[PDB]
Design a protein around this nucleic acid. Structure first.
Length: 225
DNA sequence: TTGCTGGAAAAATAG
DNA sequence: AACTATTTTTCCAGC
């Protein structure tokens, strides 16, 4: 079942859930550089993923890849690949289509719970990707990703679950300069002479049914909401 | 050695 | 063909 297919995070009594979410900022590294580390959690630990409602005593693979955080439907990000780090967990890398995918064991003895400390992020160069035949996606200014996890549970048929993380900003500059919105309804985020502006219409909100968006502004705007 | 950075200069590029 | 403010890629330095 291709990565480009959408899947539920649950089916029947099975549910794949992100227990601890990644930080909102992880600076990716290039091939012309050293590793810039595993994706960290705000704890100072690491993302945690759990599968619920698996009763059997045989372990499963958890697959990890880097997807989009865009308005369109979710897909492998053309310009970022997961990076194996070699760390508590054993892991290995396979290719699936044009996409690199990392696989971690998910074990009954740990309640199908895993700490993700062995996945960093590699930034590919826009020029290189945009040349590949069949590719029309645009790198420039597309530096937000999500960790995507999927799992394959066999019966007698295969139930295939996917959960994607909150967006991560992988750009050094955007992390220094931009406000980032994590949660709403009280706004929490990062790098908050701040203003908040609603549009459709344009109207500053005062502060430290219809379809309509807001943005937090510094300069240097967050994404629309 | 490699891993893992922070910080920033060089290079690229959109319009 | 050339420019410039903005964005990406390489580079330096320090454990």
């Amino acid at each position: 079942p291709p990565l480009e297919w959408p899947l539920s995070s649950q089916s029947g009594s099975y549910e794949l859930r992100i227990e601890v979410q990644p930080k909102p900022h992880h600076r990716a590294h290039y091939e012309t550089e050293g590793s810039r580390g595993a994706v960290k959690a705000p704890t100072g630990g690491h993302p945690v993923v759990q599968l619920h409602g698996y009763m059997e005593n045989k372990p499963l693979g958890l697959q990890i890849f880097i997807g989009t955080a865009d308005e369109r439907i979710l897909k492998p990000h053309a310009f970022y690949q997961v990076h194996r780090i070699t760390v508590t967990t054993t892991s290995y890398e396979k290719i699936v289509g044009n996409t690199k995918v990392l696989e971690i064991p998910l074990e009954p003895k740990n309640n199908m719970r895993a700490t993700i400390d062995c996945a960093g992020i590699l930034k590919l160069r826009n020029a290189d990707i945009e040349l590949r035949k069949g590719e029309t996606d645009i790198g420039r200014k597309n530096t937000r990703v999500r960790l995507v996890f999927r799992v394959h549970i066999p019966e007698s048929r295969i139930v295939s679950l996917q959960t994607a993380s909150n967006p991560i900003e992988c750009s050094q500059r955007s992390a220094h300069e931009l406000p980032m919105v994590e949660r709403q309804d009280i706004l929490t985020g990062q790098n908050f002479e701040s203003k908040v502006v609603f549009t459709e219409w344009e109207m500053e909100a005062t502060v430290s049914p219809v379809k309509v968006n807001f943005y937090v502004i510094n300069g240097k705007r967050s994404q629309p909401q």
